[PDB]
Amino acid sequence: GSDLGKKLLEAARAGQDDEVRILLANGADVNTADETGFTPLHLAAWEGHLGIVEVLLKNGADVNANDERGHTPLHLAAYTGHLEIVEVLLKNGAGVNATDVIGTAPLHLAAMWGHLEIVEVLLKNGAAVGAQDKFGKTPKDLARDNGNQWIYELLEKAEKDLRRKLLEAARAGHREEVEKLIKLGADVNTADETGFTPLHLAAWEGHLGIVEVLLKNGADVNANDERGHTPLHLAAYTGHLEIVEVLLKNGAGVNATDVIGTAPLHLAAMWGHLEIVEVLLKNGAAVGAQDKFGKTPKDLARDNGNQWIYELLEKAEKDLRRKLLEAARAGHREEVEKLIKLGADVNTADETGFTPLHLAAWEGHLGIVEVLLKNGADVNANDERGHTPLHLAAYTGHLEIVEVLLKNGAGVNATDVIGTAPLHLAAMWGHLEIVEVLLKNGADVNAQDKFGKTP
């Protein structure tokens, strides 16, 4: 009606206190808006009229009114530097961490215009120092660009304060304080003198909730201290099973080794945490890893009188050797490589004495053979029957599988239990393409077995 708002808006700019009182007394809406979004409170704070701001707030002026660009009155007071106005807006519930379209907060503007006292007030009321506009600049960064050095140290100190409160909030178990400190801008990946991060502390003290918040906020799941331990190391040492499962679920390295060479599976086996040994094993933990002292988790379980873990690891090893043997016959090269990494013993032997290299040579899986040699398979191995992989490759008739064996040092005149040699076997089956190969390495033609026969 009669655009009393506009007349209330223009009065707010000029500073006509009495006009504001009367206009409001005649029903003039307190929260009228410009075409750009400016309200009487915006303009009152923008121009710098403390009194009008106060009266507007009495009559119900929207303290957190956003315009077309998201600027709130606290921004405009922070921008122009009206300390007194700023305190009133905060006193009436202003949004200290309100962000505009650029992500700009009041603290950004205070830092960019050298308004030291405003910065203090914004901090006192819970300003987020970690705030970062769309251009990636924090208020601390803006304090540098504009040469306001005294604001810089203040923000830098506030940063460190948050960091300290976070390390002690994590250790103590204050899941609520952590949430706040993070919301204020606390760096989740900060570390102390030894290198412990909040995640190290939360995991060590057994605070699952805190661990969940940290990882939920970008905490480095594989951070490490000076000693090389990671959060998963500490969790296995102490025995917090659920924390172990949460760390593994969020990408924790299951085979990380500390400075001594110790892995999480070592610690769990050393301190009798069976249910954690199972989960580590279930999550790709390697059984063959040895610390610099030369010990494997199976040994540590034996030394510390944890037979149930010793039996579990002796089993996991036995199962690992067997899965390797079957993978060798089936020709599943992908599975074999996967099994070597977990710690599969390539020199394992079955009842007769066959090794993965025998099975690959017999079944004719050239691909499997090559992989086995790359990880230290006894090329000259010998089972109970007296045969070597060269015997089986000549028996069956896989030419290239023989050449690969001969390259890696295969005894050409190896004698079995009755004295047969690969040249004998390559003759009966008539693998003519193979016999020429055996002779290139000087295959004894005078070879006499227990029968006295000769190829």
Q: Are residues 309 and 160 in the same domain?
A: yes
Residues 6+ apart with CB under 8 A from 383: 349, 352, 353, 354, 355, 358
| Domain closes at, from 282, 313, 344 | 313
Quote the number of domains for the chain.
3
Q: Are residues 389 and 325 in the same domain?
A: yes
Contact 41, 53 (CB under 8 A): yes
| Domain closes at, from 288, 313, 338 | 313
Q: Are residues 19 and 64 in the same domain?
A: yes
Tell me how far apart the alpha carbons of residues 146 and 114 are, in angstroms, rounded to a whole number.
8
DSSP state of 416: -
Contact 55, 17 (CB under 8 A): yes
Q: Where are the alpha helices (DSSP H) in 250-306?
A: 264-270, 274-282, 297-303
Q: Are residues 241 and 352 in the same domain?
A: no
The b/e string for 56-83 (b: 16+ C-beta within 10 A; e otherwise) is bbeeebbbebbbeeebbbbbbbbbbbbe
- Phi/psi of residue 369, each to 5°? -55, -55
Half-sphere exposure of 59 (CA within 13 A, CB side): 22
Contact 113, 81 (CB under 8 A): yes
- Structure-block tokens of residue 5: 């708002």
Tell me how far apart the alpha carbons of residues 209 and 177 are, in angstroms, rounded to a whole number.
12
Q: Are residues 321 and 339 in the same domain?
A: yes
Q: Are residues 159 and 146 in the same domain?
A: no
Tell me how far apart the alpha carbons of residues 169 and 164 are, in angstroms, rounded to a whole number.
8
Q: Are residues 308 and 350 in the same domain?
A: no
Q: Are residues 134 and 187 in the same domain?
A: no
Rounded to 10 deg, the angle between the 231-238 and 274-282 helix axes is 150
Contact 4, 29 (CB under 8 A): yes
- Structure-block tokens of residue 410: 């295969």
Q: Are residues 167 and 308 in the same domain?
A: yes
Q: Are residues 262 and 354 in the same domain?
A: no
Contact 119, 75 (CB under 8 A): no
Tell me how far apart the alpha carbons of residues 390 and 411 are, in angstroms, rounded to a whole number.
8
Residues 6+ apart with CB under 8 A from 411: 380, 388, 390
User: Which amino acid is it at 76?
Assistant: L
Tell me how far apart the alpha carbons of residues 129 and 116 are, in angstroms, rounded to a whole number.
14
Q: Are residues 265 and 325 in the same domain?
A: no
Tell me how far apart the alpha carbons of residues 68 and 389 are, in angstroms, rounded to a whole number.
80
Q: Are residues 215 and 230 in the same domain?
A: yes
Burial zone of 228 (CB within 10 Å; 0-12 exposed, 13-18 middle, 19+ buried) = middle
| Domain closes at, from 122, 154, 186 | 154
Contact 62, 41 (CB under 8 A): yes
The residue segments making up the domain with residue 338 are 314-455
Query: Which helix (H) or strand (E) segment is 92 a member of?
Result: none
CATH number, domain of 103, equals: 1.25.40.20
